[PDB]
Every structure is written in C-alpha cells, then in structure tokens.
Amino acid sequence: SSGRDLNCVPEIADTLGAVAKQGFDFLCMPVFHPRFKREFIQEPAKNRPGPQTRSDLLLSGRDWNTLIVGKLSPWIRPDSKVEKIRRNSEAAMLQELNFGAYLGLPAFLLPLNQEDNTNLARVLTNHIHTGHHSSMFWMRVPLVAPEDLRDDIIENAGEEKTWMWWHNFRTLCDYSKRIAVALEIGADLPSNHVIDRWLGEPIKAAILPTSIFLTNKKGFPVLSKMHQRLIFRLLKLEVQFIITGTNHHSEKEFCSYLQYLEYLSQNRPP
C-alpha cells in the first residue's frame, strides 16, 4: 500500500523493477513526457511527426491495470486566460485521459492548484460520460495552498480555501463516484477542525513528500509526533500512500522512507 510517484522515467522496465525492489507495489508515472508540449491548432506544430508517447507493448495488460497510475502533464492549464493556451490545454487533457483509458490505468492523478477549475471539471465530465468504467480520477489537493506556505521572503508584500476548491470541483462533477481525493500533506498542519472535515471526504490516496520527514538520532527518516496522529487517522481510512520527492536523507536508502511507514502500520493502536 505505497507508491513512489516518480516524475522521471528513463526506461519503464528498469524503473518498475527498481521500485518493486524497494518495497512499493505501484508506481505513479507520467503517461506523457512532462516537457513535451503539444500543439493542436496552429501549423506547423500540429503536424509534428513520429510517435508522441512510448508504445504500450512495454508492459503486460495486467501490469498496466494494477501497478501503474497516470499523472497529468504539468503544463496543462485548462483555466488559463489565453484562449490558445486554454484550447491547447483542453486538447492535451482529453488526449491524455483517452490514452490513460486505453492503457486501462486503475487510477489517474490531476492537480488542483488554483481556486477556479470550472473548465477542468467540464472537460473531465465530458470524458467521464464516454461510457468506460475502467479508471478512477484522484484529484491532488494540498492541505495548505502554496500562497499560504511561501517562506515570506518577498519584501514588497482562510485555511479552508483548499476544501472550498475541492467542494467546488466535486459539486461541478455532480458528486460522481469516480472522483476521489489525493490529499497532499505539507510540513505544517492546519487546525483540528480542518483535518476533521477533510477526513469526511472520499480520500483514496495520501501524498507524503520526503521533505516533511525529520531526522532521528540514528539518522533514519521519521515523522513528527503531530504527523503521526494524521497518519494513524488516515490508516483507519485504509488510504493509499504515495511517498514523493527525493532522498533528502541521502545517507540512507529511499527504502527507509517506507520501512518507517510500515512501523506505524504494524504499531497502529489495537
């Protein structure tokens, strides 16, 4: 019940084998290259020849259905203010969702980072009503918006807003059961009421960036005594975990980040 969420995949077979050897059981990878922006209206970019994505023959049909989880390209901004950018984002989102369905991915991740996502909901509903029941749609959403987490380093220059964003999206999509949450945990946690409300949602996965892990006397990564409560309450929900980031504890192997997370599970209150 853990994933790696690698944003770079040199070779699919190698990455999958290495991740499996580290104790995980599924991999969150980008279906398309994160930087391979594509054009769909203006020539000559729309005539880009050659394959646009790695062929699906690299993995067995069972493997796609169970071990891989798609991620939307980071350059897609359906709600942009530039009409051309908006149309490109819509086309790219539709293409990537269709490819994810073609592979049969069990789950697909979409980011929420802005208070307006009406166009994204429109596109996602248009996709959902095609008739394929293959995949769910996890919606990445953080506890604290980036605008409230910045380090206050600028010189020149309310915690519920993230749940407001989630609520607006899920009501736009008409509470479709195929839309679930992928709550992302930050270094700091909000008030108890905010988390209590957040646990009343259909959270299917939780994201634990390695940057939030403290360091133990011995040196292995470890979570703070307040993160432990949230992790336990999530475990009660049987939510999937997605350890993302890099080896901030370079001395120890990445596997440690997961071994500790097992210690909590086997030490869960009876």
């Binding site: 403290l214 360091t215 133990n216 006397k217 011995k218 292995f220 470890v222 703070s224 005594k225 071994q259 500790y260 210690y263």
Partner: peptide, 10 residues
C-alpha cells in the same frame, strides 16, 4: 533493525 531505527526525533 537498528535499535531506535524508528525512534521519534526531538
């Protein structure tokens, strides 16, 4: 494995 491998930090 290591004694305190998962012991809580201060």
């Amino acid at each position: 494995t290591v004694a305190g491998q998962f012991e809580d930090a201060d």
